[PDB]
Structures are given as structure tokens and as C-alpha cells.
Design a protein around this ligand. Structure first.
Ligand SMILES: [Mg+2]
Ligand SMILES: [Mg+2]
Ligand SMILES: [Mg+2]
Ligand SMILES: [Mg+2]
Ligand SMILES: [Mg+2]
Ligand SMILES: [Mg+2]
Ligand SMILES: [Mg+2]
Ligand SMILES: [Mg+2]
Ligand SMILES: [Mg+2]
Lengths: 65, 49, 51, 107, 118, 152
RNA sequence: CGGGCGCAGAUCUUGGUGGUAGUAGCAAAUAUUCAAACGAGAGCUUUGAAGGCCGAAGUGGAGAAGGGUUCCAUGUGAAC
């Protein structure tokens, strides 16, 4: 339903921002049951909550110039 | 603020317990004469100083 | 902290390591009595009727 | 038969002409939906997500001129609604658009 | 001694199903309801505890699901699924009722155990 | 309770009512005059087209500022709009008036709206904030709706 | 027999209701878009993707004064 507790708890567990927490859209009913940080750590270990990588900011042109 | 005195904190505790809604059984006891607490204050609308 | 520690040693006969007092926002003081390791808080809570 | 799938070429350059910069890409999808209702005469047109990336490929104000598309009319088959059939619009990546006709594709 | 009588019959029910009708492993049967002894003032469903009013019987409702935050509550709730799925049971079948009563204050609060109060 | 224009023969008539509905009185009155004498099968189709903007509602009385539309020529008028909100509170009432007929044993396909009026309800009070520290009222205009149906 | 005894006015007092009027208006700081889930109900909630802004004297992260439960979880959608 409304997943803002899971998006907030997974950001502090993964030590990232809310813009990096990826919640699986197919298992929104399973993530909705996670109400504690210990259950989020169980979902991160199962691939349902993955930390998205950093946006690329290559210094190729900065170093080539 | 976060730095309170004991007298101020004791004053905010009473105003916090006075802001509770009227019990449901009071309404049936008075026959809907006292339906709502006429002294309910909002933290944005009414300031206690 | 000395009165609370001495009271629980008499009401229930249990030794306390330390006490952490705290006045709740509604004006009531709340204490956190940590029992000695020789006593178990789960057994004391069942005797005095907490659980 | 009602279940039919064809491939069209939507000339979006003349359907978003005169539109403001920050409304060209949103209008291009309101024109693809209108193009699907006009050709595939069934309301409740569903646009694939991969087509939404194709119209927004070059921003909001730089929309591709022609876009090869595929209109697929199907049945709801679940949750019977006033519309018995719906159109699923998908994106067809092509190299060039010259000489592309409206062809039919079979399952 | 209501405690001695209830535990004596409960061991008889477990011993009665020790080897009788055990050829197939996926058969669903067992203790449908523990023994209960009532008195004049008591109404029904009186299963006294080892220390002895509180209700000493609970039943799991599979229709409701909730994630327990307490550590001992999950250990208490896990032993129910391994032994009696959605079947009424007693708090004496745990042998650690000092801890078993600790894990029941949260399960009954989040619609996970429906009690039958006396 | 206490309708105006009591039915001529209550044996073949069904009633409906609504109090303190939060529709605009002036909008829901101009659409109440549009569906009067129509059948419930025709009034439902008309109201369902007002929502999708296929046939307008001619604002006869409260027409100060409303714009002309091409669908007002159907009503021999020049002005008209599509009160989607009013066409829904008068659409749940026709569904309730149809239920009162099915419960009473009336012929559904022959019901005719012989009387429908829209009164004013106690206005709800809100406030707006104007220039120079002034506060002007921001009032709602709810309405009471009642209607009587009969067979022909 | 005794008066606080007769209203159209006093930019009269208090309360209520009209015309204006479904009118003015909801126009400061670049932006939304496709699908899905929940739901009686979705441009507006949530999830994912796409495209953008704040661009480290931030639309970021923490405090002082001030506020005083606004903090947190669940539930409801009457009023706001
Ligand atoms: Mg203020
Ligand atoms: Mg001001
Ligand atoms: Mg006088
Ligand atoms: Mg006068
Ligand atoms: Mg603006
Ligand atoms: Mg700036
Ligand atoms: Mg509270
Ligand atoms: Mg909050
Ligand atoms: Mg909630």
C-alpha cells in the first residue's frame, strides 16, 4: 500500500538516501509487512531491497582537457 | 525549547493533559449535553505563552 | 536515585546496579532500575505481577 | 477478427507543432493515445513503458519526428468493464523511417 | 488438584496418539482442545497454570499476520507453528512459563492469538 | 419527511430525499430543472453525458458570467455548462429513488420525475485572507434535494 | 392606579439575509510523464522506470531563541 516506513528504515540501514533505496515492485505486499529494522535487514539479504549505485560522474573530459 | 525549567515543564505537562478529548461515557452520562470539550487548543491556533 | 534504589531493595528484596530517572512529558518520573546479574528481571517481573 | 496487431508510423512532428517547450513530450503521448483510439477503435489505450522512454529520449522539448509503433488490440479477460477490448501500444526500434508502410504482424 | 488432573489427561491424549494412526505423516489431527475443569463460580475453560484470573489458553489466527519486534515473542510464536497450527493449546506445554508468559503479551495484542477469557 | 407537492396517488409513486449535500446550490438547481418530466432511464443517460461533456446543462436563471456552448442549442438556449459534481449527487439520488420503487413494486422503466426541487442548506463557514490584514468569509452553499417519481 | 408604554430614519445597537454572484479569483522561484499496487472512488497517495530542478553562501545535514507533543506506529476520511 503506502511504503514510507520501509523506504525510511532501509535508508538508515543501508546508510544511503531515499533516492538509493530500491524496493521491488513485485513484492510490495511482502515489503509492507516489514515494520522493524531487523526485518529490513532480512529483506536486503534476500535481494528485495537493493542499494542503487551512484550516478556516474566520470572525470574523463576533466582529465583529458 | 529543549532547555526547559522544571516549572515550565510542569506547566506544559498540565496543559498537555487538559487538551485530551472528552471521554465517550461522559457523553452518554450527560445525554449528549456535553458533547465536546470547549477548551480544546491547537498548537498552531492558540498559544499558551 | 538513592531512594528509588533503596525502595526496590525493600519492596521486592532485589539488588540494583544503577537507576536512571526520567520525568515523562506528563509530569510523572520514570525510573530504569537495572538489577544485579545474580537476579533475573524476568523472574522478578513474574513474581510481582508485571507479566 | 477483433484481436489484430499492426505496425504504424506516428508523424509526431506535425502533431506537436506549436506546442510550448515543456509540453511537447507530454502532448506527444496524448497524441499517441488519440492516434490509437482513432486507428484501433477501442478506448482504454495502454501505452507501454518502453514507449514512454522513447518519447522522452531527448528531453521534454526535443521529441523525435517519426516514431515506429505497434498497435495491439486485445481483450480485458479480467474485471469486465464497459470497454471489452483494450489497445496495447508498444515501441518498435527501427533504423530508418523511409519507405516504411503500415504492415500487419501475426502471432 | 485441578493442575494435576489436567496434566494427567493431557499426557494420556499425547500417549494415545503416540503410535495409533501414524502411518501417514501429513495427517491433520491431534489435541483439538485441552482439558478444562470448572467449578460453581467458574463458567468454562479453566486450565490452571503450574504457578496457580488470567486465561491460560490461546489459539493462533492464520488470517492475521504481524511482525513481532520482541525477541522472546518470536521464539514463543515459532514453537506454536512447529507443534499445533491454528490449534488451541496451553501455556504449560512450554516448561518455561516464566518466559512463555512474556512472549504472549504481544501476540495476543496484535491479533495473532485469540484468547477465551473466563 | 414533509415533502412539498404530496403525490396525487401514493400507491404508484416513490420518493427520495437528500439533506446538507455539499453541491453548489446554483449549479445543482439548473440541472434539476433539466431533468424534470424525463424518465429515469432518460435522466440517467442525460446526467451521464453531462459528466463526459456530451450534452450541456442550460443555466436559465443563474447565468451571470457563464459562457455560450454549442450544446445549448438543444435546449433552445445560448448558455450552458457541465456541472459534473451536480450530475453525480443527482445520480446517486435517482439510484436511491429506483431502489424505493423496486422495494415498493413499481414499474421501473415507466417512472417519470414529476417533481424535483432544490432548497438551500445552512451555509458552512470558512475564511479567506485578504489585503491589509482583513479576513473575509469563504462560505459553502450546500443544498437540500428532494424529488417525487410517478408512473405514466 | 403605577410606567423602562407605540419607531422607517440617528454613516443608530445586536442578530440575520439579499443583489453584485457560479462573478473577481485559486498566474512569484523551468516539469512533468508511462505502467502497476491499495481502493467504492486516483492528474494529486505508494512502488518502479524515464525526463528535470535546488548545484555545497543548497530546496542538503545538525543547533540557539521560540513553539510544547506538533515527535513515532496504527486506524478514520465528518469537519479542517
Ligand atoms: Mg504561529
Ligand atoms: Mg498580517
Ligand atoms: Mg423607552
Ligand atoms: Mg427598524
Ligand atoms: Mg504559481
Ligand atoms: Mg540559492
Ligand atoms: Mg497522545
Ligand atoms: Mg508525523
Ligand atoms: Mg496510517
Amino acid at each position: 500500500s503506502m511504503l514510507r516506513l520501509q523506504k525510511r528504515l532501509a535508508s538508515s540501514v543501508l546508510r544511503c538516501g531515499k533516492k538509493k533505496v530500491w524496493l521491488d515492485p513485485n513484492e510490495t505486499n511482502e515489503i509492507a509487512n516489514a515494520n522493524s529494522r531487523q526485518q529490513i535487514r532480512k529483506l536486503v539479504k534476500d535481494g528485495l531491497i537493493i542499494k542503487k549505485p551512484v550516478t556516474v560522474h566520470s572525470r574523463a573530459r576533466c582529465r583529458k582537457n | 525549547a529543549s532547555h526547559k525549567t522544571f516549572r515550565i515543564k510542569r506547566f506544559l505537562a498540565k496543559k498537555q493533559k487538559q487538551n485530551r478529548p472528552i471521554p465517550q461515557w461522559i457523553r452518554m452520562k450527560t445525554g449528549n449535553k456535553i458533547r465536546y470539550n470547549s477548551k480544546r487548543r491547537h498548537w498552531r491556533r492558540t498559544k499558551l505563552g | 536515585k538513592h531512594q528509588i534504589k533503596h525502595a526496590v531493595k525493600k519492596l521486592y528484596d532485589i539488588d540494583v546496579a544503577k537507576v536512571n530517572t526520567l520525568i515523562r512529558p506528563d509530569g510523572e518520573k520514570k525510573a530504569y532500575v537495572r538489577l544485579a546479574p545474580d537476579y533475573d528481571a524476568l523472574d522478578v517481573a513474574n513474581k510481582i505481577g508485571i507479566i | 477478427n477483433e484481436v489484430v496487431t499492426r505496425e504504424y508510423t506516428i508523424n509526431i512532428h506535425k502533431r506537436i507543432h506549436g506546442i510550448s517547450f515543456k509540453r511537447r513530450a507530454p502532448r506527444a503521448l496524448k497524441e499517441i493515445r488519440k492516434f490509437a483510439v482513432k486507428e484501433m477503435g477501442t478506448p482504454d489505450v495502454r501505452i507501454d513503458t518502453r514507449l514512454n522512454k522513447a518519447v522522452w529520449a531527448k528531453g521534454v522539448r526535443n521529441v523525435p519526428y517519426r516514431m515506429r509503433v505497434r498497435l495491439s488490440r486485445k481483450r480485458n479477460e479480467d474485471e469486465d468493464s464497459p470497454n471489452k477490448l483494450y489497445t496495447l501500444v508498444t515501441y518498435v526500434p527501427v533504423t530508418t523511417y523511409k519507405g516504411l508502410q503500415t504492415v500487419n504482424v501475426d502471432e | 488438584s485441578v493442575l494435576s488432573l489436567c496434566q494427567k489427561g493431557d499426557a494420556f491424549i499425547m500417549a494415545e496418539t503416540g503410535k495409533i494412526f501414524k502411518r501417514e505423516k501429513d495427517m491433520k489431527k491431534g489435541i483439538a482442545f485441552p482439558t478444562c475443569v470448572s467449578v460453581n463460580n467458574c463458567v468454562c475453560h479453566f486450565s490452571p497454570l503450574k504457578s496457580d484470573q488470567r486465561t491460560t489458553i490461546y489459539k493462533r489466527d492464520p488470517s492475521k499476520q504481524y511482525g513481532l519486534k520482541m525477541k522472546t515473542s518470536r521464539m514463543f510464536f515459532s514453537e506454536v507453528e512447529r507443534r499445533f497450527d491454528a490449534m488451541p493449546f496451553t501455556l504449560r506445554a512450554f516448561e518455561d512459563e516464566g518466559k512463555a508468559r512474556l512472549g504472549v503479551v504481544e501476540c495476543a495484542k496484535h491479533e495473532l492469538l485469540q484468547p477465551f477469557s473466563v | 419527511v414533509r415533502y412539498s407537492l404530496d403525490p396525487e396517488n401514493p400507491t404508484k409513486s416513490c420518493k427520495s430525499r437528500g439533506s446538507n449535500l455539499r453541491v453548489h446550490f446554483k449549479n445543482t438547481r439548473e440541472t434539476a430543472q433539466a431533468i424534470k418530466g424525463m424518465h429515469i432511464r432518460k435522466a440517467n443517460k442525460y446526467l451521464k453525458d453531462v459528466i463526459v461533456k456530451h450534452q450541456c446543462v442550460p443555466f436559465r436563471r443563474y447565468n451571470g458570467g457563464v459562457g455560450r456552448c454549442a450544446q445549448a442549442k438543444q435546449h433552445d438556449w445560448t448558455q450552458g455548462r457541465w456541472p459534473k459534481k451536480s450530475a453525480e449527487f443527482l445520480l446517486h439520488m435517482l439510484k436511491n429513488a429506483e431502489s424505493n420503487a423496486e422495494l415498493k413494486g413499481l414499474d421501473v422503466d415507466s417512472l417519470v420525475i414529476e417533481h424535483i426541487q432544490v432548497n438551500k442548506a445552512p451555509k458552512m463557514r470558512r475564511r479567506t485572507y485578504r489585503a491589509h490584514g482583513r479576513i473575509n468569509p469563504y462560505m459553502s452553499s450546500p443544498c437540500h434535494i428532494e424529488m417525487i417519481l410517478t408512473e405514466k
